[PDB]
Amino acid sequence: SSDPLVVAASIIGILHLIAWILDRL
Amino acid sequence: SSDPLVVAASIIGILHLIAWILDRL
Amino acid sequence: SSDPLVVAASIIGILHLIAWILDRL
Amino acid sequence: SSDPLVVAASIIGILHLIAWILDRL
């Protein structure tokens, strides 16, 4: 729904940032 | 308004992350 | 405060994504 | 919990964006 989709997009952003931080380390 | 603009900025962040994930794949 | 700081960090994320989208265009 | 984890992922996204902005400057 319109509420769960916004949370799903936020989870993807966190996973992408985690990968980048791991590459910089 | 001040509430819809914050959601609009969040949607843009998710679209940008999706493109990056597609490039890495 | 603990509520305004979370919004301030979100605004920075949107500005960073906007710059990236402008570079890709 | 399910509420604190979502905030923790958001904090990581802000730190990653701050580093990028510092590199561009």
Ligand SMILES: N[C@]12C[C@H]3C[C@H](C[C@H](C3)C1)C2
């Ligand atoms: N709420 C957030 C949406 C998007 C991804 C992540 C970091 C920024 C940009 C704020 C959580």
